Design a protein around this ligand. Structure first.
Ligand SMILES: Nc1nc2c(nc(Sc3ccc(Cl)cc3)n2[C@@H]2O[C@@H]3COP(=O)(O)O[C@H]3[C@H]2O)c(=O)[nH]1
Ligand SMILES: [Sr+2]
Length: 150
């Protein structure tokens, strides 16, 4: 049922650090506008260098994050993300192309997809979250420069 569906998504979204304290009305907007994408082991969810305007929330499975760096021929494995975590916000906050690869590490991986407008009208609407995200993005820029990202 419609309401049972919204409830299952609402319960899951409340468990995401970034959305935990969001007001009910904005959480409802996320629930009405989100889309679901499934991936199999090895699939690229995001490719470094491509244009991107969507924010992702890992709803099932695990993915790996890889990045091209100076001195290396193959992208370096930066970290792994699991259910409840998110990615893709950097492109929206810096207004730039994707800065790393996100690859499905398991079969039947599932991500919740949120467009730029929705992201701006919800998360970007509260100064608390905006400030948190900017600070986090600033740290990522510093990690990139440290490992000599390409
Ligand atoms: N440049 C860079 N990106 C990183 C790094 N670690 C991650 S996982 C992650 C996700 C969310 C938070 Cl708050 C913190 C870490 N990412 C994600 O990869 C995405 C590629 O696409 P994008 O749109 O550039 O967003 C990027 C980020 O979300 C990193 O050390 N350097
Ligand atoms: Sr850049």
């Amino acid at each position: 049922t419609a309401q049972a569906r919204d409830e299952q998504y609402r319960n899951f979204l409340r468990s995401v650090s970034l959305l935990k304290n969001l007001p009910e009305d904005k959480l409802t907007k996320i629930i009405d506008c989100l889309e679901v994408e499934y991936y199999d082991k090895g699939d690229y969810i995001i490719r470094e260098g491509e244009e991107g305007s969507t924010f992702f929330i890992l709803a099932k499975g695990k993915v790996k994050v890889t990045q091209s760096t100076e001195g290396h021929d193959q992208p370096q494995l930066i970290k792994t993300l699991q259910k409840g975590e998110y990615f893709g916000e950097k492109a929206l906050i810096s207004d730039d192309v994707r800065s790393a690869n996100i690859i499905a590490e398991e079969n039947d991986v599932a991500c919740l997809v949120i467009d730029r407008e929705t992201f701006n009208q919800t998360v970007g609407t509260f100064e608390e979250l905006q400030k948190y995200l900017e600070g986090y993005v600033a740290n990522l820029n510093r990690d990139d420069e440290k490992r000599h990202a390409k």
